[PDB]
Amino acid sequence: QLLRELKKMDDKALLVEVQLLESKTYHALSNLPKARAALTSARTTANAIYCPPK
Amino acid sequence: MSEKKQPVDEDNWDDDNVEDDFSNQLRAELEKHGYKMETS
Amino acid sequence: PKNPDLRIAQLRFLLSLPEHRGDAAVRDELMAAVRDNNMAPYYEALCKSLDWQIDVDLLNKMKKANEDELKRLDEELEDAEKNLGESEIRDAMMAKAEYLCRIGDKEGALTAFRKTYDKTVALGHRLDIVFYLLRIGLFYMDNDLITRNTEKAKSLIEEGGDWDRRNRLKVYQGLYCVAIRDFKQAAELFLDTVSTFTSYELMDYKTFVTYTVYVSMIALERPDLREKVIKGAEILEVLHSLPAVRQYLFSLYECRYSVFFQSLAVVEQEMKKDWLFAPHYRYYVREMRIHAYSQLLESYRSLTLGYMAEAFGVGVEFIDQELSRFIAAGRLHCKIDKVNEIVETNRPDSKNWQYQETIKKGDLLLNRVQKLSRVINM
Secondary structure, three states: OHHHOOOOOOOHHHHHHHHHHHHHHHHHOOOHHHHHHHHHHHHHHOOOOOOOOO | OOOOOOOOOOOOOOOHHHHHHHHOOOOOOOOOOOOHHHHO | OOHHHHHHHHHHHHHHOOOOOOHHHHHHHHHHHOOOOOOHHHHHHHHHOOOOOOOOOOOHHHHHHHHHHHHHHHHHHHHHOOOOOOOHHHHHHHHHHHHHHHHOOOOHHHHHHHHHHOOOOOHHHHHHHHHHHHHHHHHOOOOOHHHHHHHHHOOOOOOOOOOOHHHHHHHHHHHHHOOOOOOHHHHHHHOOOOOOOOOOOOOOHHHHHHHHHHHHOOOOOHHHHHHHHHOOOOHHHHOOOOHHHHHHHHHHHHOOOHHHHHHHHHHHHHOOOOOOOHHHHHHHHHHHHHHHHHHHHOOOOOEOHHHHHHHHOOOOOOOHHHHHHHHHOOOOOOEOOOOOOOEEOOOOOOOOOOOOHHHHHHHHHHHHHHHHHOOOOO
């Protein structure tokens, strides 16, 4: 349901604010390539945002 | 040329091999090996 | 249009192993026979299980629903004989006619098989027919029709390449294999578990995962075993659902002595409850055993059966006849002993046992052509 809302809107950091949590949970179930894809989404996300949160 | 004395006188067909171990033997298999836990 | 009455075919398998009861027959017999115009799931069960007190208000109201369905067939194909399109009769009536095969007997042959097989060139309708010979080879538990649908489907295997449904052909060819003692091609063709996500002939995809792991735990040597069932990436979650399945694999790969049999009791409970698998409950269990003893007995050479029975549970005379049948059955070569009690193992077939099959075939098949060689003169 989070993918239904965020990837259409503008707040790109708020996407990875839960996508990185999904990158945690695909390690928690040990889904290795999908966690790699989530980390890659985080890396291609974070080059548009300065650092307003940590 | 075929006769000369004789006219007077997948399924389980491959499973028959280990079924020869299933019919004379091991029909109550885990009814004893499953009871090895508590018989002794 | 497949899975409800396929589940009633699983209810025919529920009629199979509990035989002494006639109540678990009749309860979901009536539940499957009051739903969705199904004359045959109580007609063959009228031929097998308990008969009927009456059927007038009970099930002749459903033969009246069959009459209503039939009179709207007489509406529909007479309304489609005027239309001249994509064989409107045979298409809009193969729908209701595969539904008729769901209602009644194998007259679905004449009104489905050739009724869409004499028109189309696309494999979708013919493959629905293949899937329906599969479901009726689950109804009658065929040997015929689940080979005849392969005989029909290989008429369009010769040109193909399709994403899910041809992998489902692979799945049901493997189910045909391991419906009898044919074991490795089933696992090898199931092994691409990705693209079989959900289609409306599947049951629980998780149970598809359980079936492919039950068939792939054997016919898979230890490097391939660890790489598939251990290093398998997406398999780990769909076996993280069921604990006892992952427990089964890690108890087998753990190679203990008693958790072998604890694990084996779990898969003993599991193996029966399985349609066109439960009449094959025995060679799978001792197949697990022969894989376990084979991976455990080549490594030692100063082995005592006291060292076995100290950790298997009890084996002081309990594994005696077991291992004796296993050795003298033709396989699992070691030596069982008198109270000297030293179990002695054998070669890896690197040198000695290899030297036979050459003359074993140059006798037999080359002797057949010796016969044909002696067909010269007379």
